[PDB]
Amino acid sequence: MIAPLILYLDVPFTTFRESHAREMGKTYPVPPPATVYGMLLSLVGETNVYRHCGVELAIAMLSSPKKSRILRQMRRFKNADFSHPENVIPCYQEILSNLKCLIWVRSDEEKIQPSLRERIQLAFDHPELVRRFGCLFLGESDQLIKTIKLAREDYLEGVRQWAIRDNRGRLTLPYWVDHVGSRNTRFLRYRIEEMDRLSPPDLAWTMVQSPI
RNA sequence: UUGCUCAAGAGAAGUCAUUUAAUAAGGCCACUGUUAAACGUAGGUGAGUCGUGGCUUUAUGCC
């Protein structure tokens, strides 16, 4: 079987807000599979979210990022008048600094050709043939990606912090996100096990599927 | 196209007014640079101004 694609990520700042963290901007320690899937769709310029259902992603943390809080005068739709003072609320947002990670992309379970792995490989092969809009980012639109590149299993040849699907794990990362409410959001429990493993273990793979 | 798409902690503020490190003090008292000698005899040099004036025989030397 074709070897899974490996991407090296380096984002100076990230915000993977929690699904239930609406009063305060609490962030996940590791990018959720849904956020990575959306980033890959943006990378290949695919607006439809159901197009690449079935792709399996594995995330390996190259280092533990530090969590910091920043104040922000975030806006909201509370009053009909745009200039009303009620539309601006001060709230904290937790960010992660100097995030480096390796992403494994495996597209065996996709039923629509070309697969996401092939699309990413073709986009990296001929960047001038990619038809997309906006700037690539991970998390919030202002959190641009510093380095995204094709890498091998030993890019830093160091020790890797894998995200393992453990039913007793701490983190509850979503692989599908409902941006309106929380009905269609689907969750999975993960843990961060320190494993130099270059390759992902079997439990480190998460398949992105529709909530149906 | 990413729990995403939009999102200024923003506008203003003298650390200010006053305060002698001041009053007193000898680095002082003592010291010999004493004693003796044969010059026997052989070593050198760096710098201007331009056409008769008082004596004196032109002379040629003095001021």
Q: Give the resolution in Å.
A: 3.1
A33: CB within 7 A of chain B nucleic strand: no
How far is the C-alpha of A155 from the C-alpha of A144, rounded, in Å?
22
Task: Tell me which method was used to determine the 3D structure.
Answer: cryo-EM
How far is the C-alpha of A33 from the C-alpha of A204, rounded, in Å?
11
User: What is residue A94's three-state secondary structure?
Assistant: strand
Read off the tokens for A80.
């009909």
**Long-range Cβ pairs for the range A41-48 (8 Å, 24+):** A41/A116, A42/A132, A42/A134, A42/A136, A42/A137, A43/A120, A43/A123, A43/A132, A43/A136, A43/A148, A44/A116, A44/A119, A44/A120, A44/A123, A44/A130, A44/A132, A45/A123, A45/A130, A45/A131, A45/A132, A45/A133, A46/A119
How far is the C-alpha of A136 from the C-alpha of A42, rounded, in Å?
7
How far is the C-alpha of A36 from the C-alpha of A44, rounded, in Å?
12
Q: Decide: A2 and A120 in contact? Cβ < 8 Å.
A: no
In whole angstroms, B15 C1' to A83 CA is: 40
Question: Residue A23: how many CA atoms within 13 Å on its side-chain side?
Answer: 0
CB contact set of A100 (below 8 Å; sequence gap of 6+): A8, A9, A10, A61, A62, A63
Q: Which residue has the tokens 């990296």?
A: A124
Cis peptide, bond prior to residue A29, ω within 30 of zero: no
In whole angstroms, B59 C1' to A188 CA is: 146
A207: CB within 7 A of chain B nucleic strand: no
> Which nt has its C1' nearest the CA of A37?
B2
CB contact set of A82 (below 8 Å; sequence gap of 6+): none
Phi, psi of A14 (to 5 degrees): -140, 155
Read off the tokens for A99.
């995030």
- Strand runs (DSSP E) across chain A, as ranges? 5-14, 56-61, 66-75, 88-106, 147-150, 161-165, 171-176, 186-194, 206-207
Nearest to A196 by CA among A163, A162, A155: A162
Phi, psi of A202 (to 5 degrees): -65, -40
